[PDB]
Every structure is written in C-alpha cells, then in structure tokens.
Design an enzyme around this catalytic site. Structure first.
Site, PDB file in Angstrom:
ATOM      1  N   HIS A  40      25.959  57.850  12.307  1.00 49.36           N
ATOM      2  CA  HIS A  40      25.144  57.501  11.147  1.00 49.36           C
ATOM      3  C   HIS A  40      23.718  58.034  11.269  1.00 49.36           C
ATOM      4  O   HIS A  40      23.053  58.273  10.253  1.00 49.36           O
ATOM      5  CB  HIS A  40      25.115  55.977  10.973  1.00 49.36           C
ATOM      6  CG  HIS A  40      24.066  55.507  10.013  1.00 49.36           C
ATOM      7  ND1 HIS A  40      24.132  55.763   8.661  1.00 49.36           N
ATOM      8  CD2 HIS A  40      22.919  54.812  10.212  1.00 49.36           C
ATOM      9  CE1 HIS A  40      23.078  55.231   8.064  1.00 49.36           C
ATOM     10  NE2 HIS A  40      22.326  54.650   8.982  1.00 49.36           N
ATOM     11  N   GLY A 141      18.771  47.577  11.316  1.00 51.34           N
ATOM     12  CA  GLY A 141      18.346  48.244  12.522  1.00 51.34           C
ATOM     13  C   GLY A 141      19.205  47.983  13.739  1.00 51.34           C
ATOM     14  O   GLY A 141      18.948  48.583  14.792  1.00 51.34           O
ATOM     15  N   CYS A 143      22.299  48.845  14.239  1.00 44.50           N
ATOM     16  CA  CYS A 143      23.287  49.895  14.479  1.00 44.50           C
ATOM     17  C   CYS A 143      23.156  50.480  15.883  1.00 44.50           C
ATOM     18  O   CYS A 143      22.062  50.794  16.336  1.00 44.50           O
ATOM     19  CB  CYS A 143      23.107  51.007  13.436  1.00 44.50           C
ATOM     20  SG  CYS A 143      24.476  52.150  13.300  1.00 44.50           S
TER      21      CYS A 143
END
Lengths: 299, 299
Positions: A40, A141, A143
């Site tokens: 991502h 945040g 991830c």
C-alpha cells in the site's frame, strides 16, 4: 484467573521502522538487511482501483524514506511479493532477533504491536478468527503493524502485518510472504468477511478454568462425543472440536471429561440466564488451552 | 473499538533482574545502581507471623544473589523501606530509562510486566480499583513484577511492585517508596479487602466511547446534575463523579453532556436486559478518559 496478555514486545520494537513513499507513510519490519512492509505504501492517491503492477513498474527508489527511531536507512532495491514489499537497505539491523516466519491458522493466538509512524504505541493479544480477521484497536496509520509469537526457546515467529480495516470494523493482515489472510484485497473495496464461529477448543479451555476456580453450577453430567458435537456445532455457529487428549492435564485435575464439557456447551449455547461464569454472561472463546495452562500452572 | 492494551514493554524489560536470598527467589527492578524488590525475599521459611525488622537485623549481604541474564551484580549494601528493599549494587544499569516514581490513585490505569525469575513473561493493562487492588494474572514467583506508565515525553513512571495475592484472588502491590497500596500486610494472612465501587469517571468514558461507535440505544434524553448523581452514587456502590470539564472533547464530538450520561448510568444501573453496549452486558469501568481519547483519536 484469566487475563488476555501479550508476550513482551522489546525484541520486536527494535525491528519496527517508518516507511514512506512520496507522501504515504506506514510501518515496516527490519530484519537483517531487509524491510518488509505492505505494498500500500506505493499506491497512488486516487479513488479508482489500484493497479499495483503498474505502481511497481513506475516505482523509483529515491521516493522511499525508511527510518528506525528517526535514523534514516539507505534503500538499495525493492521487490514485490503478494501484498508486501521487500526493501533491501544498505545496513543490517544489529538487533535482529532469532526468528522464523510462520503463517497463522484460525484459532491461533498471537501478539499485535500497534505502531504509528514507525513507533510502537501498544501491545495486545488477539486470536485469528475463523473468518480470517482479527478484532484489533487500530486508527489511521497502523498499516504494517506486526504480529508475532515468541517460542519457548526465544525464537520470534513473525506471522502478521496489518493491511486494512473492513467496513464492518474487522481487521485484515498478511503474512510475511505477502499472502493476505482470508484472500481479502489489500485496497479499499466493499468486501465483507464471513460469519465468525465460536472457537470450540477455546470454550472448552474456558470451562476447565471455571471448574478450577470453583465455578461449576453449569456443569452437565450428559456426555456428547466428538463426532456428535461437531455435527451440532455445524448447525449452531461453533467450530469443530479438534481433539480431546490435549486437555488431559485439566481433565485429571478436575474430574470432568471433555465430552461433559461438549454437552455443557450445548446446554449453555444460548445464554446463562442470568448467571455468570468467571464474570462472563455468555460463553467465552477468548482463551486457548495453552493460555489457560500457562496462566494457571506456568506450563 | 475499545480494547485493553498495554504500553510497549521494551524499556522496562531491560530493568528486570532476578533477586535471590537464601533459597527465596523473586524479581527486582534495576535503575542506576539500585535494585528495588519486595522485602519478602528475606523472609524466613515459616508459618508464624514474619518479623521483618528481625529478619532485616540478621541479614547478611553474602546471602544475596542478583543477576541479569545470568550475569551477577555485586551487592554493596541494603536498606529496608516499608515493604521494599533497596539493594545497592556495584554496577549501574546502562539501559536505565528516563524515569520518575509515581504513586497511583484509585481509577488510574497502568501496565504490568509479569516476570518470573527475573524474566518477563507477559504484559497487560490494569486499573487500580477503589479497594487498592488489581485483577491481574500471576502465579508463584511473580513477586516484584513492576507496574509502569510511559509519559508522552518518554519518561517511564514506575508505580507498582507486585507483593501478594489475597484470599479472594485480587492482587496487592507497593509503590517504589515501600508503601503498600491499601496498607495490606505484605505477608500471608486472612485479610479481606473492602468491596469495590464502580469508578464513575471510567463508566462515563466508556459511554462516550459507545456513542462514537453509533451505539446509542441506551442514551437517556434527560439529565441529572453532578450533585444529584453523587448522592445516588453513595447509595448504589458508585464513586462520586470527578468533574464535567474533562470530557469536553468527548462532549464535543458526541455531542452529549456528562449530565445525560450520569442519568443514563442511573437507568442502566440494573442490567441491560438483554441488550449490550460494545459487547458488554453491564457497565464497564475498565477504561479511563485518557485511554478512550488515545484509542479513538491518538491524543
């Protein structure tokens, strides 16, 4: 007594890094000279479907910034493996713990180190559910927050990298090979996880803990064998029970067979009306057998 | 979502040591050139009441063994302060974090690092109850396990050293000055703690959290003021509510006044019958205002 606990996080904290590509920031895990993070981080800012093959082809190394505790690491190369990137950096983490990579199965417990901008903020234990999601506590945040277990010999098993939150609130991650648990897509979409089943092995462990704390108002003298319970469980939102003999340590201390507890689950399946078992008002599948034995006897 | 989490444990793990006196082994906390540990470590083996002044008077330094990761620290001197010993050692802990010592108040949340033979095994968040006990998970050998909080600036607040399990199963500790929380005796006895009150401040925080997840079926339209609630709280096993000003950030986003939640507490005082709030079947005083704000908004 039973408390959901995490194994100590210090050795994993020393591996967490901040990974930035352009303006996008998330967390990665630095072992040896490799940083693993969700892919991502290279996604373009857009509302249409992400073509990660295209983003990978157009990727430039100088757009990366990788740091540990604010100390920036040089990026040497990057390859894409499923839903993760493997970023080679120009120095090795001198605090890399003895480790392996392990893919979880439903019913496995593990630890999450919730991280933001490469900095750990919290740690908690979780169970991988039958729908391949977990119930974490993550905000924007998180991830790339890693999941781990620590073996008795001290080997760290790296097993989870946080990927996405589904519309239902369920959390989805990948293993370190880039395989997303449950084959969910690693980008925004309308996907929904399947129904959660109660983890029968954990409920049996919970009822043994109740017995060992003197709570037995609910105990059935009926017995249901494994094959019969597994057929009932199909129709009532429960997993199969995996085996009986692993509970012998608890079966001997109590006087109670696993088959009596299987019957008790069938008896208590709808509710306690309105009593409680160890403070819970319905059956609890939060604790594994290993956790109950560890927390009650140190084994 | 609301999940009890611990703050990362790495900086505290590097302070835990094994403290032995004769055959008795427990955990200590090594900061600078001082190791603090429960004075239980110098107790004679007996079933009579322990006279710690006499045990201290007959103490010999050479009976101590203090080790970190299997290497031994030279003991230089020992003083007794309430329920703890301060062992001076000939090496300073090079991993001593920036730190202060803080005495908890009922309603305060903190982290426990559960340790055995000087080695950390688990970490979890707890809340100090109104009877100055906590509900942890400990087996034999956890004495001296430290409790801590980590401030925004990185400073570790050392606030708890595990001392004893009461007959009820509740856990008792001291602060680092040697005062036992609740002034329980730090030796085997028949002491019974007073009954816990519901921490109204934490219940208010919990209801604000439910509102932020669309869980609102329980919201009363009407209001009760603080004075009226506090009168009711005495009669029904709840603490007085502290102030309304703290919850303004929550009162803003929701946007519900504390007085509406206090009225809701009065209505929800008996069971939910048979609904649920964030999975709970009764009111939860597990989470502080700071926790809800940190977990929802990262502040």
């Amino acid at each position: 007594g039973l408390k959901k606990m995490a194994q100590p996080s210090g050795c994993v904290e020393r591996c967490v890094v901040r990974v930035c590509y352009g303006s996008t920031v998330l967390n990665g895990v630095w072992l040896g000279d490799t940083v693993t993070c969700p892919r991502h981080v290279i996604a373009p800012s857009t509302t249409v479907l992400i073509d990660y093959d295209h983003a990978y082809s157009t990727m430039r190394l100088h757009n990366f910034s990788v740091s540990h505790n604010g100390v920036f690491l040089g990026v040497v190369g990057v390859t894409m493996h499923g839903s993760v990137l493997r970023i080679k950096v120009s120095q090795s983490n001198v605090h890399t713990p003895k480790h392996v990579f392990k893919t979880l199965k439903p019913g496995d417990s593990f630890n999450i180190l919730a991280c933001y901008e490469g900095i750990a903020s919290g740690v908690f234990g979780v169970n991988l559910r039958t729908n391949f999601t977990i119930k974490g506590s993550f905000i924007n945040g998180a991830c790339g927050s890693p999941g781990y277990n620590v073996r008795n010999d001290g080997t760290v098993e790296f097993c989870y990298l946080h990927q996405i939150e589904l519309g239902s609130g369920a959390h989805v991650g990948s293993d370190f090979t880039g395989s997303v648990y449950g084959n969910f897509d690693d980008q925004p979409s309308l996907q929904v996880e399947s129904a959660n089943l109660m983890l029968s092995d954990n409920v049996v462990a919970f009822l043994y803990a109740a017995l060992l704390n003197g709570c037995r108002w609910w105990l059935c003298s009926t017995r249901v064998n494994v094959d019969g319970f597994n057929e009932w469980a199909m129709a009532n939102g429960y997993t199969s029970v995996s085996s009986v003999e692993c509970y012998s340590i608890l079966a001997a201390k109590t006087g109670v067979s696993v088959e009596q507890l299987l019957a008790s689950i069938q008896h208590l399946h709808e509710g306690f009306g309105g009593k409680n078992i160890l403070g819970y008002s319905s059956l609890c599948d939060e604790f594994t057998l290993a956790e109950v034995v560890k927390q009650m006897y140190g084994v």
